[PDB]
């Protein structure tokens, strides 16, 4: 059934924490923090595989496929949490990046019995979203041995889809199945086996990179500006006008006056501000260039 | 109108990423990695305020109070994330830690028009759970000025509950309304305003400290072993045996039978074995020392 968690870094005891139940309020947090320092280092070793991951996702994005995340508990929850930010940040379809967690919606707030052992359930979760060859499955689990995720990668592989694993123990079985193996080696957790801590931080960090970088490549932003933001509150309604001014050194309320001379679409707005085109002509420029403001602005 | 935005760091541009969209794919994720490196260092400056908050929270817990997180968007989902792992890790009640997100549950997967700007609702939400003065309120917002969170903090103060603010801008209204202000200064985000990144990472590490430190101080572990684990899947089940053996040096066979007897309670099982008592007497001697496995046994 298991009995060889012994060989896994993720089940291993951290030396500098053996008397953590004895240490002080400040000793404990300092330690955790000292341990958190290791997380960005371990992402750093992983960057070239991460780069390649991104570039192949753009490719898929471009053939019309989707970025699909799978994971149990924390890993699952973090997949939904990256997928959730992509529309209001980048302006894309809510379907473009979907996070799937074992146990369905209830698993978001609380664990499900054996949800991570349910090899049949993943096959239904993936079938229900019409998972296809054009898609990319990113399988996520610190141990690299979660049956749910393992079976998920397999079906994906069997449909000829691009597969990526994100695990914390090297040479894992998820790593063997997948096409790109991302290996977050963070060392033993402060609490032995608590992958919610370091490993779930690494996982957030990669996911973030995966969506942020691909979206950049698709011209879903201009310079370092969030030109495709959905402004759905006061802060972003303001950042909107702020962003039009930042791109085009514009006086002032022309920034406002172009925003609703379309809709709050900073990208369109600055396009018809810089290129001095009509709203409809600014648009069709952008359409021919897949929304890449730098290309449509020419040169 | 509400800008104001020029002031805040969270809204500033990151000079190290002006031509990020005209950069190599290896170059983008490496930029990100570099910025991620800055995040644990930011947490390091919050170590005294963070330890301050832990102690205070250990007390409300000991007074039968609850830890309660609030936020909209990414901060909200992180709050749900942190709380969701406390029951399965530390064996406590689903009520001891609760994440509440603006927009409510419908916000768990996607944004909700202007939910972060709601003065009411935060009232409603904080009454459906009957938030009392014994309860602790943690307001999370990178900007430091989100309406929902401020309103939430005001209602908790003008009530006498302990209040904690986590934010990424110095001298934030939230930080002033609050007793303990934790201020995670993480600098400009590579994508201007995409606080789902460093600030989101910084907020995950703070919340992980608050809960993981607390539960250690309250006895939810022995040494660095995760006793109080709930065996949900085949992995944690095997790990339960691993805990009893690492703590007693007692061979696979006995540990199993003991756990089978102690209903998969590793803390009880560890107690029955080394103190050679029964489940009845181990269970009572343990509450005599408040489930602190190192007092009960020894002392």
From Swiss-Prot, chains A, B:
Organism this protein belongs to: Haemophilus influenzae (strain ATCC 51907 / DSM 11121 / KW20 / Rd)
GO biological processes: 1,6-anhydro-N-acetyl-beta-muramic acid catabolic process; amino sugar catabolic process; N-acetylmuramic acid catabolic process; peptidoglycan turnover
Listed pathway(s): Amino-sugar metabolism; 1,6-anhydro-N-acetylmuramate degradation; Amino-sugar metabolism; N-acetylmuramate degradation; Cell wall biogenesis; peptidoglycan recycling
Name assigned to this protein: N-acetylmuramic acid 6-phosphate etherase
Subunit structure as annotated in this protein's UniProt entry: Homodimer.
Domain of life: Bacteria
Record-level Gene Ontology MF annotations: carbohydrate derivative binding; carbon-oxygen lyase activity; ether hydrolase activity
Miscellaneous comment as given in the Swiss-Prot or TrEMBL entry: A lyase-type mechanism (elimination/hydration) is suggested for the cleavage of the lactyl ether bond of MurNAc 6-phosphate, with the formation of an alpha,beta-unsaturated aldehyde intermediate with (E)-stereochemistry, followed by the syn addition of water to give product.
Pfam families for this protein: GKRP-like_C, GKRP_SIS_N
Similarity remark: Belongs to the GCKR-like family. MurNAc-6-P etherase subfamily.
